[PDB]
Amino acid sequence: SSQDIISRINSKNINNNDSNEVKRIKDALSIESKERILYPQNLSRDNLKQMARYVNNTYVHYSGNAVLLSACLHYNIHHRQDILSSKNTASPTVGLDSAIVDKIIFGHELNQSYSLNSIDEVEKEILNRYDIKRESSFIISAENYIAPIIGESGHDFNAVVISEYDKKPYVQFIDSWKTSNILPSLQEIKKHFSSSGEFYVRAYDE
Ligand SMILES: [Cl-]
Ligand code: NA
Ligand code: NA
């Protein structure tokens, strides 16, 4: 599947209004294809921390862009391998659309949920999907995430359902961009939102 990403990134069939965005992705993205030991089928919380650390290969003093980081991490989780990572030096906020990122990484726009009104409701929706279909990995899009200095802004992050021995499955939120706290608790991540709340969930399906 990594070779498909390479084919799409380099293709000539791109509207030149998108070519700058695609060049930004190309410059940021690294693809490690060497055959290595996979992560386990049943992921641990520790596995998620290692995966989140891997995707964010930005230079010191650069933050990268959450839309690209979250897509990379989602892709890696899906394949149970550290394949994609970002060294993006471009803006954390502007110049990357989730639609273009999804087309590049996954080969299509991912289907988004209906809008959810709180991170609590996100958690419940994800647990519902896990209960019914055992869907366990998602990209979360938030409309009014409070980022340092800039304030309310769109933000993408991840969530994975972790199933530990003899414990109820729980949602682990993962924010590979927020390197101060890459595995926030619900309570912690809620601090970054006021009531101005809108969230969407999406996931890659093969
Ligand atoms: Cl910014
Ligand atoms: Na950095
Ligand atoms: Na935090």
Numbering used by the authors: 8 to 213
Please quote the authors directly.
In this work we have determined the structure of SpvD, a S. typhimurium SPI-2 T3SS effector protein that inhibits the NF-κB signaling pathway. In this work we determined the structure of SpvD and showed that it is a hydrolase with a papain-like fold and a catalytic triad composed of Cys-73, His-162, and Asp-182. Structurally, SpvD can be classified as belonging to the CA clan of cysteine proteases that contains papain and related proteases (MEROPS peptidase database). Although SpvD is highly conserved among different serovars of S. enterica, serovars Typhimurium and Enteritidis differ in containing an arginine or glycine, respectively, at residue 161 near the active site.
Interestingly, conversion of the SpvD sequence to that of the Enteritidis strains increased the activity observed in the DUB-GloTM protease assay. To explain why the Gly-161 polymorphism leads to greater activity, we crystallized an inactive (C73A) form of the variant in the presence of RLRGG-AML substrate. Although density for the RLRGG-AML substrate was not observed, we were able to build additional loops (two of them near the active site) that were disordered in the previously obtained SpvD4CS/R161 structure. To map a potential ligand binding site on SpvD, we superimposed the catalytic triad with that of the UCH-L3 ubiquitin hydrolase crystallized in complex with ubiquitin. The position of the superimposed five C-terminal amino acids of ubiquitin (RLRGG) is unobstructed in the SpvD4CS/G161/C73A variant (right), whereas in SpvD4CS/R161, binding would be impeded by the side chain of Arg-161, which restricts access to the active site (left). Modeling of the RLRGG DUB-GloTM substrate onto the Arg-161 or Gly-161 structures provides a rationale for this observation, clearly showing that the side chain at position 161 forms part of the active site groove and that an arginine side chain here restricts access to the catalytic triad. When compared with the Typhimurium SpvDA154/R161 variant, SpvD with a single polymorphism (Gly-161) was more potent in (i) the DUB-GloTM protease assay, (ii) inhibition of the NF-κB luciferase assay in PMA-stimulated cells, and (iii) virulence in mice. Furthermore, we demonstrate that a natural SpvD polymorphism significantly affects virulence and NF-κB inhibition in PMA-stimulated cells, leading us to hypothesize that the substrate hydrolyzed by SpvDG161 might be part of a signaling pathway involving protein kinase C.
